[PDB]
Design a protein around this nucleic acid. Structure first.
Lengths: 40, 65, 191, 61, 56
RNA sequence: GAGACUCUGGCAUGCUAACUAGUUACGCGACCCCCGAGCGGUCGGCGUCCCCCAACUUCUUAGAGGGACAAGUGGCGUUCAGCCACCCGAGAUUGAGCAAUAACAGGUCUGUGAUGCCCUUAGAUGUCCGGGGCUGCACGCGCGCUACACUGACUGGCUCAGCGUGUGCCUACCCUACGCCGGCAGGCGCGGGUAACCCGUUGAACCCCAUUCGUGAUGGGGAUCGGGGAUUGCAAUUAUUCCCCAUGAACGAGGAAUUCCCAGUAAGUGCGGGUCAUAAGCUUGCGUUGAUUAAGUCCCUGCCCUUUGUACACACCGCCCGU
């Protein structure tokens, strides 16, 4: 039997396979900026 | 005595550019770091080989699609 | 010493390696000389790196042979150091010139390949490169003195010097020459 | 009629086993004249030979 | 057997979860089925179907 | 599946910290006492003196992170994939470990309380005891040890490692300092070690420096055979191992043929572990001295891919024609 627990869970078996890769999606690399002085 | 890159290396290099073309530039040791920061690879050496193909690839993107 | 490099006694200068072809492969007359035989010896990794090895060190390497004596550089240095000294007496001249003269006139100029015409043995004369001339020279000289001194009261030092002097000049009674002329004979036959 | 010659470029190996090699040469005394010959041993571009048969004009073996 | 002194030991039976990722539990289940005449075909597919339902 | 992955090797004066791996500078806190010099300072030292309030960098101590990716450069290229020579530096890398689908009437019922079926079972193929043999010799085959000498053998003096193991085992047992006696077989006394704290700085050989020998089957070589000593055990004959005197054979680099191998590799040299009451010419690891030749090809032997041809399919160790 071949287990799925590829990232962790309740228990993590020696995290992931040497060749499986996961990218994170930005959602934020747009930033249409202008010289606004938004003090905060 | 030969050095060819595999599908895992190439495909991820493609995806990384197609997301984060602004983070990256023409320097290897910065391109090295950002890939570590965004992505979670299991191995230091796999980290290296991906970036080396990324940087080779940027110089092509400068001119010619 | 910051201007001259001896072997303790005699000098790498005052000698003229006298050819063009056998240039570029012999490290004796170069100002990049050494006081002694073997250094570490990285000179085996690449293809043409062995050309940049001092000629005496090359010679020293070849002597220890036939299994009874492997890994005995220091023994061979004793032979070499005694050997160049005995040269000095018999002619009062730098043995280095006597050495290059042999290496020069001991490399065969012509040879036959074993082109057996796909299983029907008949050869064909060809030409020889510089580096192989240098190698077969040393191999022939080293397997001179050896077989001469095997069951005899002479020692390697005398027998080495004897064949060495007779090969520098054309003596026609040394192992090196008797074989060199033979190979040229055979090539001219099936030329 | 002993002669000399420098090498210009290496063409390819040859022989039943890949021991001889084809080369092209000029005679170091006239530059226009030229031949191609078979040699034995490690030979690189930039070398000098002692030719005896000054002319053979060899071909594919 | 192992010569421990009296009271030096204590036992705890404990329920397990995940009947379908462990293998020994499946093998010992598969034993008695084959002993009782059943078809090698129906059984092997059945345990195989169950393990895949589990999460493997 | 290959790759990726794990282990090991190679680099860091950067981090971490140290008598149970353990020093090295200072004080010499002592060296002993002159321990030498010398009329003195100065040099010298490996262990011997400690609690452990005089540093850890450089061995082995061992954890973390770092570092190398064809990244920079010149050429070559469908200017893609990528290839060759170079700049700094370790530039594909010692290396191994793991290993797919389908299979072979491959081997193992003498590894198993893994097991079918047959055989036997009190005058036993069970299970104990005594002895013997598995080693017997007109011949043939293979894996290896020693040597055929002077680049050497003998006799004295100098100088350097590393992987390891070690006392009470499931049914029976350690590595050894120091002394006293004799060459060893040794043998008596006391000590240490459940271990880099004791053996132990594992004072190893080959090497190296000097005497004897001088081409003489010779002091090369050490089979064979006699005699005497001791040690293990209940027991040494068919000599089980070891020591001493004598004995002193074949062998002058080996025909046809054939094996292994290109970087700390071949080869030489000897230390440990396994077997072990008694023990290595074997195997498995370890270091130590350290070459020649290539950087290519399909000619001999074999492997992979495509195209082709076939009267073969237990598959050319095939099928098959006549007298």
């Amino acid at each position: 039997i071949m287990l799925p627990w590829d990232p962790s869970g309740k228990i993590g078996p020696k995290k992931p396979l040497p060749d499986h890769v996961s990218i994170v999606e930005p959602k934020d690399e747009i930033l249409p900026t202008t010289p606004i002085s938004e003090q905060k | 005595m030969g050095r060819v890159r595999t599908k895992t290396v190439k495909k991820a290099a493609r995806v990384i550019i197609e997301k984060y073309y602004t983070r990256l530039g023409n320097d290897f040791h910065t391109n090295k770091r950002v890939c570590e920061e965004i992505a979670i690879i299991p191995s230091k050496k796999l980290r290296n080989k991906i970036a080396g193909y990324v940087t080779h690839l940027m110089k092509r993107i400068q001119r010619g699609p | 010493t910051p201007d001259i490099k001896l072997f303790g006694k005699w000098s790498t200068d005052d000698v003229q390696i006298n050819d063009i072809s056998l240039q570029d492969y012999i490290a004796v007359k170069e100002k990049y000389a050494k006081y002694l035989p073997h250094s570490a010896g990285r000179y085996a990794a690449k293809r043409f790196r062995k050309a940049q090895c001092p000629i005496v060190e090359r010679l020293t390497n070849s002597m220890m042979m036939h299994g009874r004596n492997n890994g005995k550089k220091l023994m061979t240095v004793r032979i070499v150091k005694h050997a160049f000294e005995i040269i000095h007496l018999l002619t009062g001249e730098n043995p280095l010139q006597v050495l290059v003269n042999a290496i020069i006139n001991s490399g065969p100029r012509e040879d036959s390949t074993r082109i057996g015409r796909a299983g029907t043995v008949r050869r064909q004369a060809v030409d020889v490169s510089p580096l192989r001339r240098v190698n077969q020279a040393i191999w022939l000289l080293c397997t001179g003195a050896r077989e001469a001194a095997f069951r005899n009261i002479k020692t390697i030092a005398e027998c080495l010097a004897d064949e060495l002097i007779n090969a520098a000049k054309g003596s026609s009674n040394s192992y090196a020459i008797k074989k060199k002329d033979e190979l040229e004979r055979v090539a001219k036959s099936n030329r | 009629p002993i002669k000399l010659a420098r090498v210009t470029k290496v063409i390819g190996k040859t022989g039943s086993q890949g021991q001889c090699t084809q080369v092209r040469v000029e005679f170091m005394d006239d530059t226009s004249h030229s031949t191609i010959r078979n040699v034995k041993g490690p030979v690189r571009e930039g070398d000098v030979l002692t030719l005896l048969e000054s002319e053979r004009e060899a071909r594919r073996l | 057997r192992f010569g421990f002194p009296e009271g030096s030991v204590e036992l705890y039976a404990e329920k397990v979860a995940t009947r379908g990722l462990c293998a020994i539990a499946q093998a010992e289940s598969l034993r008695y089925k084959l002993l009782g005449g059943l078809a090698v075909r129906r059984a092997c597919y059945g345990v195989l179907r169950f393990i895949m339902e589990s999460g493997a």
